């Protein structure tokens, strides 16, 4: 019935509300961390001193390619990995849903959900979408500190050097751009805080000298500027393009293009 939902809907952690989707997410998030810790302790021979010295070297690898997209692999040969991915899939998606309903509850736009969705997009391509299009779980990313890095290094070399993948190049421009853009903005708002500049919502509803000086600073500098609201529209796009363009760039690696260097010499 509704009483149960209502009961969960009032779940909290101090003054912050967790709600139904939040409880399912934290629970789902624990099982994930429990599946990886259980495998890590095993690899450490249940020895805490070994667990701490090799912490970064442990890795929960995916099923071998001979298993395709099946769920046959035994626990210690891809079984655990599959379980951990399931739980993580639910934790993330539950949290996404929580962000959508919470915005709805406070009567706000869904901008946060949309931006989050872009991050989820790259994650979905690395561990779910791409492996399925390649035909095997073995193509997915391992759960480990150093191992997922080794995975990243190998993925590039195998595909002809990702520096030649135009989408990896766009993704980078946007990553640097995000840093270039938060420095400018963060610095612009601090430079006019002496005029209440940080109160952006009020500067939008009733422009002040702080917002005008921010604009003129850049107009005189680079020839153009933005408004107190529009600046945040550049910000959200500059940041979501990082994972949008790159997800596309990885989804194209190995499925459409085998060697980016070669592809690049042709175009």
């Amino acid at each position: 019935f509704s009483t149960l939902l209502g009961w969960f809907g009032n779940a909290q952690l101090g003054p912050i509300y967790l709600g139904s989707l939040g409880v399912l997410s934290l629970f789902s998030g624990l099982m994930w961390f429990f599946t990886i810790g259980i495998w890590f302790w095993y690899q450490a021979g249940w020895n805490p001193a070994v667990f701490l010295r090799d912490l970064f070297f442990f890795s929960l690898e995916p099923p071998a390619p001979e298993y395709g997209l099946s769920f046959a692999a035994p626990l210690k040969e891809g079984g655990l990995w599959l379980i951990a991915s399931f739980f993580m899939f639910v934790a993330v998606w539950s949290w996404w849903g929580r962000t959508y309903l919470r915005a709805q509850a406070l009567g706000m736009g869904k901008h946060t959900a949309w931006a989050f969705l872009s991050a989820i997009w790259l994650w979905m391509v690395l561990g779910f979408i791409r492996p399925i299009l390649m035909g095997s779980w073995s193509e997915a990313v391992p759960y480990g500190i150093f191992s997922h890095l080794d995975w990243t290094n190998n993925f590039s070399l195998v595909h002809g050097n990702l520096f030649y993948n135009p989408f990896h190049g766009l993704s980078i421009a946007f990553l640097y751009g995000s840093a270039l853009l938060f420095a400018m903005h963060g610095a612009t708002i601090l430079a006019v805080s002496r005029f209440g500049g940080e109160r952006e919502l009020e500067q939008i509803a009733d422009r002040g000298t702080a917002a005008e000086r921010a604009a003129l600073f850049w107009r005189w500098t680079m020839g153009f500027n933005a408004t107190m609201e529009g600046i945040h529209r550049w910000a959200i796009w500059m940041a979501v393009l990082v994972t949008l363009t790159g997800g596309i760039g990885i989804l194209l690696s190995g499925t459409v293009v085998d060697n980016w260097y070669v592809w690049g010499q042709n175009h």
Partner: protein, 246 residues
């Protein structure tokens, strides 16, 4: 008969990008446009970007609405006069920049009401009226003498105006010699051990600081008057600023 899916996608992206930039640039034209001649008349040459369609903003606490883009509000005589017959040169103040409100001393005709918080109460309140705010930020300025860049005392700290919601001090209230009080922006004062130093203003410019009506609340318009004025002193109170500034 096929095609390269990668060359297609990277081609589609740039189209999308060009389209995104157009959207973003027109979106940033809800304030300040149309452009004008240094005279005040439209420029006719507004550029390759057109103004967006009007959007209405419904202000909370029943403060009304706001539609942009629209008629440029900016209303108050600008005590500035041409310096050249050609465009692209400075406009020199005709009177007293500090008192006229131009240059780094400029302020904007904002709504003459205080900023409200979620509950509908004033966002900024004098600490000796706050709902239980104690001075634990470190050093307490209440009681200290305030001096200017001329190295002369202009008054003393009487109270602290705190921003309830964000919970931080935004103004230092200082009693001038004549007994009347003025508000000083926290970002414009340095609270020392035995005093408060204000490098943006000269002791004799403290009186010129715009005053607030209700002695318990400050409105947006009053905030711009004060801040624009205090900040303008960095440039205009320069001839009276003593060296060894630190």
């Amino acid at each position: 008969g096929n095609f390269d899916l990668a060359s297609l996608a990277i081609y589609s992206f740039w189209i999308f990008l060009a389209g995104l930039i157009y959207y973003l640039q027109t979106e940033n034209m809800r304030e300040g446009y149309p452009l004008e001649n240094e005279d005040g008349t439209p420029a006719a040459n507004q550029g390759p970007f057109p103004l967006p369609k009007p959007k209405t903003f419904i202000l909370p606490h029943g403060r009304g609405t706001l539609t942009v883009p629209g008629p440029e509000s900016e209303d108050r005589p600008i005590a500035l006069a041409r310096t050249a017959v050609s465009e692209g040169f400075p406009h020199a103040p005709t009177g007293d920049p500090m008192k006229d409100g131009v240059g780094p001393a400029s302020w904007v005709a904002r709504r003459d009401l205080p900023e409200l918080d979620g509950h509908g109460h004033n966002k900024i309140k004098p600490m000796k009226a706050a709902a239980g705010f104690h001075v634990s930020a470190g050093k307490n300025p209440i009681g200290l003498p305030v001096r200017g860049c001329d190295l002369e005392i202009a008054g003393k700290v009487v109270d602290i105006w705190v921003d309830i919601p964000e919970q931080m001090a935004r103004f230092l209230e200082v009693e001038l010699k004549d007994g009347s009080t003025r508000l000083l922006p926290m970002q414009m004062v340095k609270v020392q051990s035995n005093r408060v130093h204000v490098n943006a203003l000269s002791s004799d410019l403290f009186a010129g600081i715009p005053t607030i009506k209700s002695p318990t609340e400050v409105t947006l318009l009053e905030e711009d008057k004060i801040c624009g004025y205090v900040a303008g002193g960095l440039m205009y109170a320069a001839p009276k600023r003593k060296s060894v500034v630190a």
